[PDB]
Scaffold this active site. Structure first.
Site, PDB file in Angstrom:
ATOM      1  N   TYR A 120     -11.011  -4.840   3.335  1.00 55.83           N
ATOM      2  CA  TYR A 120     -10.176  -4.283   4.387  1.00 55.83           C
ATOM      3  C   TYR A 120     -11.004  -4.246   5.669  1.00 55.83           C
ATOM      4  O   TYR A 120     -11.971  -3.489   5.769  1.00 55.83           O
ATOM      5  CB  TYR A 120      -9.700  -2.904   3.955  1.00 55.83           C
TER       6      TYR A 120
ATOM      7  N   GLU B 201       0.839  -1.184   0.000  1.00 50.62           N
ATOM      8  CA  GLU B 201       0.000   0.000   0.000  1.00 50.62           C
ATOM      9  C   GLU B 201       0.880   1.241   0.000  1.00 50.62           C
ATOM     10  O   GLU B 201       1.778   1.375   0.840  1.00 50.62           O
ATOM     11  CB  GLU B 201      -0.929   0.017   1.214  1.00 50.62           C
TER      12      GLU B 201
ATOM     13  N   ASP C  85      -6.770   9.232   9.443  1.00 54.67           N
ATOM     14  CA  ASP C  85      -5.432   8.855   9.879  1.00 54.67           C
ATOM     15  C   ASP C  85      -5.088   9.416  11.257  1.00 54.67           C
ATOM     16  O   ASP C  85      -5.459  10.546  11.595  1.00 54.67           O
ATOM     17  CB  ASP C  85      -4.403   9.301   8.852  1.00 54.67           C
TER      18      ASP C  85
HETATM   19  O1  LIG Z   1      -1.285   0.197  10.986  1.00 56.91           O
HETATM   20  P1  LIG Z   1      -2.143   1.439  10.921  1.00 56.91           P
HETATM   21  O2  LIG Z   1      -2.733   1.647  12.311  1.00 56.91           O
HETATM   22  O3  LIG Z   1      -1.329   2.654  10.488  1.00 56.91           O
HETATM   23  O4  LIG Z   1      -3.327   1.215   9.788  1.00 56.91           O
HETATM   24  C1  LIG Z   1      -3.002   0.608   8.560  1.00 56.91           C
HETATM   25  C2  LIG Z   1      -2.640   1.638   7.470  1.00 56.91           C
HETATM   26  O5  LIG Z   1      -2.514   2.928   7.997  1.00 56.91           O
HETATM   27  C3  LIG Z   1      -3.700   1.706   6.376  1.00 56.91           C
HETATM   28  O6  LIG Z   1      -3.625   0.587   5.544  1.00 56.91           O
END
Ligand SMILES: O=P(O)(O)OC[C@H](O)CO
Ligand SMILES: Cc1ncc(COP(=O)(O)O)c(C=O)c1O
Ligand SMILES: *Cc1c(COP(=O)(O)O)cnc(C)c1O
Ligand SMILES: O=P(O)(O)OC[C@H](O)CO
Ligand code: NA
Ligand code: NA
Ligand code: NA
Lengths: 245, 383, 383, 261
Positions: D175, D49, D60
């Site tokens: 997801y 990703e 985020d």
């Molecule tokens: O591991 P995190 O908490 O940053 O979440 C997964 C990514 O940010 C998004 O795929």
């Protein structure tokens, strides 16, 4: 009353009254008393002493600044009374008029104030902010001790108001020559002295030709203020007043 | 013009003609349905009246006693009760054909209210302000000038409220023919104490009708702060003949009466003459006027309205005081409890109602005159 | 939840259940008479409505054309229209069992409004505020703290309003069990544009009835400043169907559109998605959100309500802009001619009405929405 | 067939679980991203990703917020990440690449123009955090037209009805958001989203190999972002960012697998 005796002697000679006003305690009370003696010498017929008040509602810039200086030197009623007694130790002649606002009268105690007036030798009172309606207890006290209450009349005063101020006046009636701050003339019995604004010898003889006396204040106070402490002050006040004579 | 032995017109003879015309002009206006309908029009659409009478539920519950209602004078245009009075006098001036209104101001609240209605009425406006007060109130000076008024500093005397009133009276007597002097409290010579009370009575007239509709009964007590006394007279007057209603005026004790630096005229002053009225007064041994000190400048008038002197001596009204710390505590409580930021003046009344409410039964009712909003004081409180 | 092509719910899936709960909750409250009656109670006794519709007679005469009426939202408790919306949303939060409300604020007006109703209702309140805005609104930050709210500074992103809304959204999604997010304008995902517009329609509903009573006609034009768009939608919506009534929204041009330093989303933005809504946006060529620029911080949202996007595209409303200089001159003119100190935000509307009034006949009517008082802006204007 | 489908099918035949690292493109700069992608592949990543940095990333947590702000100040644009993906494809045609982007950059770019550039550059899938199915009709038809998978998120508070609807439009994988909240490394933790046969990957919060191993026992793949972005941010600063990321992701790779007995 000294005031009554003084206007009588003037009229016997066909003369007009010269009535200087100064603020007591400006620049200090020792200079006030030398001033009163020099006003006497220069020919004053009646001396008005301003009792300094923190809120002179009826006074223009000049006399307001004089009151402020006088209060800074510690001038109080009792201190002025003591200066008058000193004066009376020699000059048992010249009439003394206190110009004072009412609240210092009222706080000192009316009956006490007037009694202290008669004992010190103050002959007349001028209370700028006390009209005849509210002047009863003061009038009763002053009538007991023979101190005159000089009331003011203004050009804008109604005829009814002139008549009522006349029925309560003593000593002389004080004609304010302009509706402001620091016939007209007529026509009840008492001496009429004209004040407010007169600041040159021309104007003063001009007022002399119409009334029984002329009152001059700001013009003399101005010279007290400008004379840098030397004195000087006395000599300047004396020569100015001689010219007004 | 007399309230028992108080009141009257202790003014020089040169002012007596101006006062007689004013006496007669107001007596006619007081009874003129057209003047009154006009004044009501501007109070409605310009000032925003009526103000609500607000049940302070959180505060009531936190104090544990009487129900607390706030008369919301903080919601007037300009944020205080002063405009009710300034509007009425300025409307009188306008209908008299006066071109110019003058006013004194200490903290600038009356000066702002005066410049505001002068701007709305198209009158020239001059506000006299002591130089010491100018230096402490830059914001209100700026607003007065934004409103088109001229601000005239008074650097004579003690350069404060006392001295601005004298200069204003001096201007008035010199310019009576085209100038109206808009006095800012229930003080000075007749007919100003009566006239200012009359213009402020709208507060109590609304509150009386509102409290009757919210509770079907008159209040058990009305609490208002007292400097010169105008907001208190406005809410008291319409309840004077209701014997069952206690009338409680709250003065500023500052750092404590015992320190000397206070503004408690009724509780510690003594009778004297100031600015044309016989009343209670803060004065020294020689009768020289003293200046008053408090956290809230709106309470620093050395005197008080003669009608309160009358009410105090006859016992119709009871006068108390709260300190600077107490007003500050109330300022904070009301903000956090009701979301109303009150003027520091008004928080003296809140501070006292905070003491009275517990003493009172739950079913009882207290109306607090919330005379102004506290946005102007937020800077002072933080320091 | 769509206004033509605009609006929608462009939020992460983590937030969709919260939005469904909110729209269903609002739907029930909307049509519950107890809710509407409780809201009307607080609008009257706490906020102080109805606000007046005031004929600005000096201004009308100065400009020489149309009659100018001012809808006096400057008279609400707290001094601005914002409290109408915070109040309705906080009442809904309590009805949903939320002990905690959060809000974003830019200039601090919504944050003050939210803290104000939270204090009155007894709710926990947290306001998010970008650190650049904190640094410029010390007084409003101190009001929020006085009212018992916590201020959380947002130092992420561009440290201003858009970043505060992002953080508040993050807080909401994390704490939805106990938290209600009181959005400050007609922006964000459905049902917030709809819901905020409904809680502000009280403005136009009063205004419509007041002008008919005062003048017996509907306005020729209604002029309102437009940041996020909530005061404008509040006065516009009840006139939408009055086809003869022009609806003119005034945006901030700052130094001038051509300089790039403006906040004129409708006139210079382009369509895009921000904070959950498809609408017009100030954005760069890569779709990144740009900062808006105005002498008044209140007009600084880079988006605008999707319902204004729809009104612009259909031509029901017309959107124009005035510069900082023009707003400043209106601020000054209204102060000195009517004694009303307007918010610099509302000054933009006053400024365009000054351009339009002389171009109409004396029989015609302009209503200006006076969205707030300008006491807060007096320092800015002096600078 | 889409590279994403090919990757999941191959892992299924091997009895293995997909490790899916997320990094922000252009943080600290695009040359370093390229190096990082190559490192990630060598470390066993199955799908990568790439976050397209946005100025208002609603979904985020602080870590990835800071990476986005850094990536934007380093000049990152959509066109620049596309060129980096094309440099990637010059030498690596195998690794599936997913763009994670908020919607407004896509809008603005031009929806069909964006999906077309995805297919030509070699981007296999799209994660659009602020775009629910009800708003995704336009992007979904362009994606279908060009063979680009559209991966939708399912949250613990999504109802069975919303899942049906999500899985109806999903492609590539589903997801599964482990937490109702925002991205960010957390310490804790069913779905079991089978109204679909798509592979299911779990993300949000997975910060340590032990957590990655726990996730790998229940889902077809494990997504890790914030924890990897931390290692980029915390070096601080020699391009030795690569070794720390490579070392961490090798731990994750040994962890993301069916547990032994
Ligand atoms: O591991 P995190 O908490 O940053 O979440 C997964 C990514 O940010 C998004 O795929
Ligand atoms: C808000 C407020 N309350 C009270 C006062 C005190 O004035 P007065 O006693 O005349 O009402 C002032 C001045 C004021 O501004
Ligand atoms: C905040 C504010 C605005 C701008 O917000 P809108 O949603 O566009 O109304 C306008 N006027 C005032 C007084 C404000 O406080
Ligand atoms: O000369 P004036 O104008 O100051 O007036 C006279 C004195 O004030 C004494 O009354
Ligand atoms: Na009202
Ligand atoms: Na007092
Ligand atoms: Na905008």
């Amino acid at each position: 009353n000294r005031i009554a005796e003084a206007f009588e002697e003037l009229k016997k000679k066909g003369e007009k009254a010269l009535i200087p006003f100064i603020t007591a305690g400006d620049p200090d009370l020792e200079t006030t008393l030398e001033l009163v003696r020099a006003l006497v010498e220069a020919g004053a017929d009646i001396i008005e002493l301003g009792i300094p008040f923190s809120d002179p509602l009826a006074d223009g810039p000049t006399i307001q600044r004089a009151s402020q200086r006088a209060l800074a030197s510690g001038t109080t009623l009792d201190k002025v009374f003591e200066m008058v007694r000193e004066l009376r130790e020699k000059n048992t002649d010249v009439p003394i008029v206190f110009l004072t606002y009412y609240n210092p009268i009222f706080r000192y105690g009316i009956e006490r104030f007037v009694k202290e007036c008669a004992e010190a030798g103050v002959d007349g009172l001028i209370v700028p902010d006390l009209p005849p309606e509210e002047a009863a207890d003061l009038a009763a006290a002053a009538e007991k001790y023979g101190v005159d209450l000089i009331f003011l009349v203004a050009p804008t005063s109604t005829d009814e108001r002139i008549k009522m101020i006349a029925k309560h006046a003593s000593g002389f009636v004080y004609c304010v020559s302009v509706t402001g701050v620091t016939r007209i003339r007529k026509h009840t019995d008492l001496p009429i002295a004209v004040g407010f604004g007169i600041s040159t010898p021309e104007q003063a003889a001009e007022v002399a030709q119409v009334a029984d006396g002329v009152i001059v204040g700001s013009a003399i106070v101005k010279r007290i203020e400008e004379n840098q402490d030397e004195e000087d002050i006395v000599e300047e006040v004396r020569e100015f007043v001689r010219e007004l004579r | 013009g007399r309230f028992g032995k108080y009141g009257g017109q202790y003014v020089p003879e040169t002012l007596m003609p101006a006062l007689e015309e004013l006496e007669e002009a107001y007596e006619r206006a007081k009874n003129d349905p057209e003047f009154q309908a006009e004044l009501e029009y501007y109070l409605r659409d310009y000032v925003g009246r009526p103000t609500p009478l607000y049940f302070a539920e959180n505060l009531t519950k936190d104090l544990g006693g009487a129900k607390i209602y706030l008369k919301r004078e903080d919601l007037n245009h300009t944020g205080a009760h002063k405009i009710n009075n300034a509007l009425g006098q300025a409307l009188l001036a306008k209908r008299m054909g006066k071109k110019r209104v003058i006013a004194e101001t200490g903290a600038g609240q009356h000066g702002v209210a005066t410049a505001t209605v002068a701007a709305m009425f198209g009158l020239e406006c001059v506000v006299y302000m002591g130089a010491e007060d100018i230096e402490r109130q830059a914001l209100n000076v700026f607003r007065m000038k934004l409103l088109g008024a001229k601000v005239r500093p008074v650097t004579s005397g003690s350069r404060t409220l006392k001295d601005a009133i004298n200069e204003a009276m001096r201007d008035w007597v010199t310019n009576v023919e085209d100038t109206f002097y808009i006095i800012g409290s229930v003080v000075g010579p007749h007919p100003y104490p009566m006239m200012v009370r009359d213009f402020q009575s709208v507060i109590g007239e609304e509150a009386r009708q509102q409290i009757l509709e919210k509770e079907g009964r008159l209040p058990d007590a009305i609490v208002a702060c007292v400097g010169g006394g105008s907001n208190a007279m406005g809410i008291f007057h319409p309840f004077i003949d209701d014997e069952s209603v206690r009338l409680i005026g709250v003065e500023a004790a500052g750092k404590g009466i015992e320190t000397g630096k206070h503004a408690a005229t009724l509780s510690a002053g003594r009778p004297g003459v100031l600015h044309g009225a016989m009343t209670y007064l803060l004065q020294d041994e020689d009768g020289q006027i003293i200046e008053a000190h408090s956290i809230s400048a709106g309470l620093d008038y050395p005197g008080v309205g003669p009608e309160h002197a009358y009410l105090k001596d006859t016992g119709r009204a009871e006068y108390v005081s709260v300190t600077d710390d107490e007003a500050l505590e109330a300022f904070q409580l009301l903000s956090r409890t009701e979301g109303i930021i009150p003027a520091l003046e008004s928080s003296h009344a809140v501070a006292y109602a905070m003491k009275l409410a517990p003493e009172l039964s739950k079913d009882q009712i207290i109306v607090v005159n919330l005379s102004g909003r506290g946005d102007k004081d937020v800077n002072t409180v933080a320091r």
